Amino acid sequence: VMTDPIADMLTRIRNANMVRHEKLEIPASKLKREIAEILKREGFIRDVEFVEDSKQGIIRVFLKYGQNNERVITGLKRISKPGLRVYAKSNEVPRVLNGLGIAIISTSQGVLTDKEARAKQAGGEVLAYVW
Amino acid sequence: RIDPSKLELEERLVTVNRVAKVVKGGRRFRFAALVVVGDKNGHVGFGTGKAQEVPEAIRKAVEDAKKNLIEVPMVGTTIPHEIIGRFGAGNILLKPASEGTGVIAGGPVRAVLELAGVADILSKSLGSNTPINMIRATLQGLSELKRAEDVAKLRGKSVEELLG
Amino acid sequence: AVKIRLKRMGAKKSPFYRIVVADSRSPRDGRFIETVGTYNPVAKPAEVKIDEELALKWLQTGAKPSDTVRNLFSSQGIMEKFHNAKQG
Amino acid sequence: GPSWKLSRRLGISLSGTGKELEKRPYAPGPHGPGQRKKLSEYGLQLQEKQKLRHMYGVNERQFRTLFDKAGKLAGKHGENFMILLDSRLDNVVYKLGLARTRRQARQLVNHGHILVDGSRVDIPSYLVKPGQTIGVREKSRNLSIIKESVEVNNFVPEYLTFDAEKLEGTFTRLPERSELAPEINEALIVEFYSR
Amino acid sequence: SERNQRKVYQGRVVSDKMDKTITVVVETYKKHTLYGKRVKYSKKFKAHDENNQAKIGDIVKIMETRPLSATKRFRLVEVVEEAV
Amino acid sequence: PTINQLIRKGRVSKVENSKSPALNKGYNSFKKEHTNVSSPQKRGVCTRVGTMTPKKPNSALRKYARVRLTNGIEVTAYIPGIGHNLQEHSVVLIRGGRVKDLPGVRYHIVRGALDTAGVENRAQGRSKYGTKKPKA
RNA sequence: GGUACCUAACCAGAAAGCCACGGCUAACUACGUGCCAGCAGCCGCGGUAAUACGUAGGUGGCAAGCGUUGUCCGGAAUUAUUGGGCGUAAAGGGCUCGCAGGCGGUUUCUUAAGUCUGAUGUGAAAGCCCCCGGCUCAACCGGGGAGGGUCAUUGGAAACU
RNA sequence: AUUAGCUAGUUGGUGAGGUAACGGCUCACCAAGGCGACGAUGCGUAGCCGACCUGAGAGGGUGAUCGGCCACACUGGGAC
């Protein structure tokens, strides 16, 4: 069943971070690979690689702790749930914790972060907040 | 991280409360005084104390608040971002404001924030009206915050590409 | 039918007028088509503003200006170059 | 109004004086030797509101109107509010030193003539536009109040220029931060008017 | 020049029992102003068929016109698909 | 609740009731209806005046003037001032106010009405209770 | 309409009241009355020492006004998408089978209905707001912009539904 | 919804009559055609809109003076 897999990706990341685990394994769609490499580029995670298998393919993600005890990725949130979709124009595109936290928004070309989506002046599916 | 006592603090009391206890000969009566203590440079603590005399409860509460202090982020005399202090069925939503609005807050929360020395914060109390629960909620909220440069060094980036 | 006439607004003692194009059936302050210029009889400086191309277009398609708009159009020469356009 | 009861209630004189602070630190009734209780937060906010509006002598509706005008204006609210109420013309006459008190400055503006770009001015928020030479004409020269005002010497403000022999004053670009808040603790007025 | 075109829709036949007309439901649909969810409301029209060349359940293109009857405004353009 | 439950069921707002029911209904002669006017004050002819005690263990004898309004709703109102000069067959104006101590009384009698003479020896709170200034 | 204004000749003289003062809520003292007379928006006050009732003085708020009533919006995150909950506080249908309805695992091409973004025409004028001018700023009166659009035609993008 | 059936020119066509016109707006043939749970029918209430009041905002109430559209002139009907 499991409706959307984006919620399971975000809450698997949140559960492993809140128990302070070291890595995770996710069923690895292309949107999972895209969100994971956005997180790798933004530094919220330490590493990501995907192993191929006939099952679905499995992507494993390695969390980040610079100092010995902290949580770098301080929270995750799904906004564009099924059953209530949400969209943004190019001028009300959101900055949550202004300058400090990122949003994952799939516009008409690529799936992009908030600051570069503003630099491109395009909007789309506002799907994730990383706090 | 414990803070030393080599600071000047203003120890403005917020609330005392008449507190009872029942025994065989009737009622014994004490006063529970809670105060908020902190300098204007960004350190805040609260204190509670029970005594049979009101200034005795005051000195006990200020000694407890000197024992327990915590430091808040004060970059640009206004908090870096929006936050919700959540503890104990009081929900204080804290939101930064532009530099001329002044502090907009309910009573105990305005006492804590004015004693911190913030200039412009809009806050709303979305929970209960119990003063100790508001104090613990707003101190958990002020503890939750973090530096922009702290976010920069934990993400491995610099402040200019955090801001843009 | 269509006329270029005045429309009154402003305070009680001090009026102000808009030179406007509307049919004669419409009331004084009521339904109009478009506005061409203002008029201020109170102020001692003369030569209140008229846009003077759309009024020219309205005179081209035909309209009946009132006396005061007629002689101010004569005063700064709108209907004179209208007459030159008619005669050539 | 008796005009000393306000000073001995609020603890600050109208301009600061050697009078109305000695032997009377309290206004009300038989309640002098009793201990002055500390006020609530609403008490401090209302006392600051009354302090600024009784320093400048203006009604509550005009206080609210210029508060909304100042906050609607760009800049910052509380100090922009004190900028506009500094630029109010009764205070302009008092800073120019044509009067002893703000009440007598109000009287002189109301019935006496001040020729600044027009014969009579009664309405308060008018400003002298710099760059033109307009002065109070010869009808009010040999008057006791103006003679007393020119023979007394006070601290001339740096944001007003003023001449002695032709007795006229003119503005500067803006009133300044150093003289903006000399004894007043601001950001309690905006906190009072938020509620 | 070229005259202005009229509105053209496409939909499903739901009844051809009555003569020289077909009824076309249209599944274009609207959203709440206050919650913002994409909810389907089905509105049906009346059309005018000349040779009865339509069956119940066929995707049909229709174009609005002057009133041909009481509650009859539209016209057949084409029968783009046919049912089983 | 889920968004689809909100879509097909809505959110029914809470319904509030006014604390002065008889002041919100008018009446006319030849149409025989109780249509609403939301009147702030109403006049009426007093048909019974007489006193009894409140329901709380505190006790005092209060005036309890019963009156029929123009729209025909007989209600009991309260006489505030120190003493009164009201009597049966007197036209008297009424405002709405809650008397907590008495039960079943929801209106006050305004003083300075068409017949209500104001109380004497009042120099504080004098715009209420219908008393003019004694000396200029 | 000899109306505002301008010149003038003499008098501080003809021109201030309303409400509150236990807590919320800024501002208190004496005298009468003693579950009586009365107050009250809630807590409640008064059965001989009443800051809660009426006076007298004083203070406090506002000002040609000031209070009460009536109606509506807030504070009410107290019908909660923004912004609530359901073990014991009000709140899980006694449980199942299922129509319509509401949601949908991964990959690859395809259309652009939803989605996002240009162009044009429109959403009249007065209104709110932004910037200037006039009646002794003023209330107001004007001059130029911003929109209150799931609006109609058309071009572009294909990540998501 | 503590209003589940409504429609007895209403249903569409053929023609024939038709206010400036399109049209059951009227006469001859077939259908219970058409409309309904996405609320038809019925009961109650109401002129509507630019706007106004409140609210930080989403949103909640009001339709006065100014402006646009509509309806009525004691209550009905009628035509010149």
Contact A66 B153 (CB under 8 A): yes
Residues with Cβ within 8 Å of B121's Cβ and at least 6 positions away in sequence, in order, are: B78, B79, B94, B95, B96, B97, B103, B104, B105, B113
F2 neighbourhood in chain A, CB within 8 Å:
83
Chain centroid to Cα B27, Å, comes to 33
Q: Which residue is nearest to the C1' sugar atom of G45, using CA?
A: F58
Q: How many CA atoms lie within 13 A of F114 on its CB side?
A: 12
- Residue D89 sits at the vertex; the CA angle it makes with D83 and D95, to the nearest 5 degrees, is 75
Q: Which two tokens stand for residue E40?
A: 């389907």
Q: Which two tokens stand for residue A119?
A: 């630099």
Q: Which two tokens stand for residue A70?
A: 């902290």
A100 neighbourhood in chain B, CB within 8 Å:
80-81, 148, 151, 162
Q: Say how far apart CA D117 and CA D109 lie, in whole Å.
A: 14
First to last CA, chain D: 29
Handedness of CA A42, A45, A49, A55 (dihedral sign): negative
Indicate the burial class of D75 (C-beta count within 10 angstroms; 0-12, 13-18, 19 or more).
exposed
D48 neighbourhood in chain B, CB within 8 Å:
none
Sheet architecture: strand order including C15-23: C34-39, C15-23, C2-10, C64-65
Rg (CA), chain F: 20
Contact D77 B101 (CB under 8 A): yes
Å from the F136 CA to the G15 C1': 14
Q: Does B164 touch chain A (CB under 8 A)?
A: yes
Optimal mutation site among B147, B154, B158, interface A, most CBs of chain A within 10 A = B154
Q: Which two tokens stand for residue D163?
A: 């001449």
Q: What is the 3-state secondary structure (H, E, C) of chain B?
A: CCCCCCCCCCCCEEEEEEEEEEECCEEEEEEEEEEEECCCCCEEEEEEEEECCHHHHHHHHHHHHHHCCEECCCHHHCCCCCEEECHHHCCEEEEECCCCCCCECCHHHHHHHHHHCCCCEEEEECCCCCHHHHHHHHHHHHHHCCCHHHHHHHHCCCHHHHHC
* Residue whose token pair is 């919700």: B84
Contact F4 E32 (CB under 8 A): no
Å from the F55 CA to the G52 C1': 21
Contact assessment for residue D51 and residue D11, using Cβ atoms and an 8 Å cutoff: no
Q: Say how far apart CA A103 and CA A84 lie, in whole Å.
A: 18
Residue B155's closest chain A neighbor by CA?
A: A43
- Residue D175 sits at the vertex; the CA angle it makes with D174 and D179, to the nearest 5 degrees, is 155
Contact A66 B154 (CB under 8 A): yes
A79 neighbourhood in chain F, CB within 8 Å:
none
Buried b (16+ CB within 10 A) or exposed e, D77-116: bbbbbbbebbbbbbbbbbbbbbbeebebbbebbeebebbb
- D–C touching, 3+ CB–CB pairs within 8 Å: no
Q: Say how far apart CA F13 and CA F109 lie, in whole Å.
A: 35
Q: Does B13 touch chain D (CB under 8 A)?
A: no
Helix (H, G, I), strand (E, B) or coil at E40: coil
Way it was determined: cryo-EM
Q: How many CB atoms lie within 10 A of CB B74?
A: 17
Å from the D42 CA to the G61 C1': 14
The residues of A whose Cβ lies within 8 A of any Cβ of F are 83-84
* Residue whose token pair is 């009894």: F52
Q: How many CA atoms lie within 13 A of F52 on its CB side?
A: 9
Contact assessment for residue A74 and residue A13, using Cβ atoms and an 8 Å cutoff: no
What element of type H or E holds D68? helix D60-72
Chain G: nucleotides below 7 Å from protein CB are 6-8, 17-21, 24-29, 35-46, 54-72, 76-81, 84-86, 101-108, 113-118, 124-126, 129-131, 134-143, 150, 153, 156-160
Q: Say how far apart CA C19 and CA C49 lie, in whole Å.
A: 10
Indicate the burial class of B50 (C-beta count within 10 angstroms; 0-12, 13-18, 19 or more).
middle
Looking at A35-78, which runs of residues are DSSP E strands? 47-51, 58-62, 76-78
Residue B156's closest chain A neighbor by CA?
A: A43
E38 neighbourhood in chain A, CB within 8 Å:
85
Nearest-Cα distance to chain A for B163, in Å, is: 4
Chains that touch F (3 or more CB pairs under 8 A): A, E
Contact D191 B102 (CB under 8 A): yes
Residue F8's closest chain E neighbor by CA?
A: E39
Amino acid occupying residue F71: N
Q: Does A86 touch chain E (CB under 8 A)?
A: yes
Residues with Cβ within 8 Å of B22's Cβ and at least 6 positions away in sequence, in order, are: B28
Optimal mutation site among B155, B157, B158, B162, interface A, most CBs of chain A within 10 A = B155
Contact assessment for residue B45 and residue B37, using Cβ atoms and an 8 Å cutoff: yes
Q: Between A and E, how many CB-CB pairs are < 8 A?
A: 8
Q: Say how far apart CA A97 and CA A48 lie, in whole Å.
A: 25
Q: Does B119 touch chain D (CB under 8 A)?
A: yes
Picking from B145, B79, B161, B75, the residue whose alpha carbon sits closest to that of residue A43 is B161
Contact F4 A84 (CB under 8 A): no
Contact assessment for residue C19 and residue C37, using Cβ atoms and an 8 Å cutoff: yes
Using the CA of A27, give the nucleotide whose C1' is nearest.
Answer: G106
Q: Say how far apart CA D8 and CA D160 lie, in whole Å.
A: 31
Indicate the burial class of D118 (C-beta count within 10 angstroms; 0-12, 13-18, 19 or more).
exposed
Contact A84 E38 (CB under 8 A): no
Q: Say how far apart CA F114 and CA F2 lie, in whole Å.
A: 60
Contact A42 B81 (CB under 8 A): no
Picking from E84, E33, E27, the residue whose alpha carbon sits closest to that of residue E56 is E84
Nearest-Cα distance to chain A for B164, in Å, is: 7
Say which of D75, D79, D194 has its CB closest to residue B104: D194
Indicate the burial class of B37 (C-beta count within 10 angstroms; 0-12, 13-18, 19 or more).
buried
Amino acid occupying residue C16: F
Q: Which two tokens stand for residue B90?
A: 């009081």
Indicate the burial class of B38 (C-beta count within 10 angstroms; 0-12, 13-18, 19 or more).
buried
Indicate the burial class of F93 (C-beta count within 10 angstroms; 0-12, 13-18, 19 or more).
middle
Q: Say how far apart CA D182 and CA A6 lie, in whole Å.
A: 60
* Paired residues of B70 in beta bridges: B44
Optimal mutation site among A84, A86, A89, A92, interface E, most CBs of chain E within 10 A = A84
Q: Which residue is nearest to the C1' sugar atom of G156, using CA?
A: A108
Q: Say how far apart CA B42 and CA B75 lie, in whole Å.
A: 10
Which value, to the nearest 10 degrees, does the dihedral of the CA atoms of residues D46, D48, D50, D56 take? -160
Using the CA of F13, give the nucleotide whose C1' is nearest.
Answer: G79
Q: Are strands F107-109 and F74-78 parallel, antiparallel or unpaired?
A: parallel
Nearest-Cα distance to chain A for E36, in Å, is: 7
Contact assessment for residue F106 and residue F129, using Cβ atoms and an 8 Å cutoff: no
Using the CA of F11, give the nucleotide whose C1' is nearest.
Answer: G79
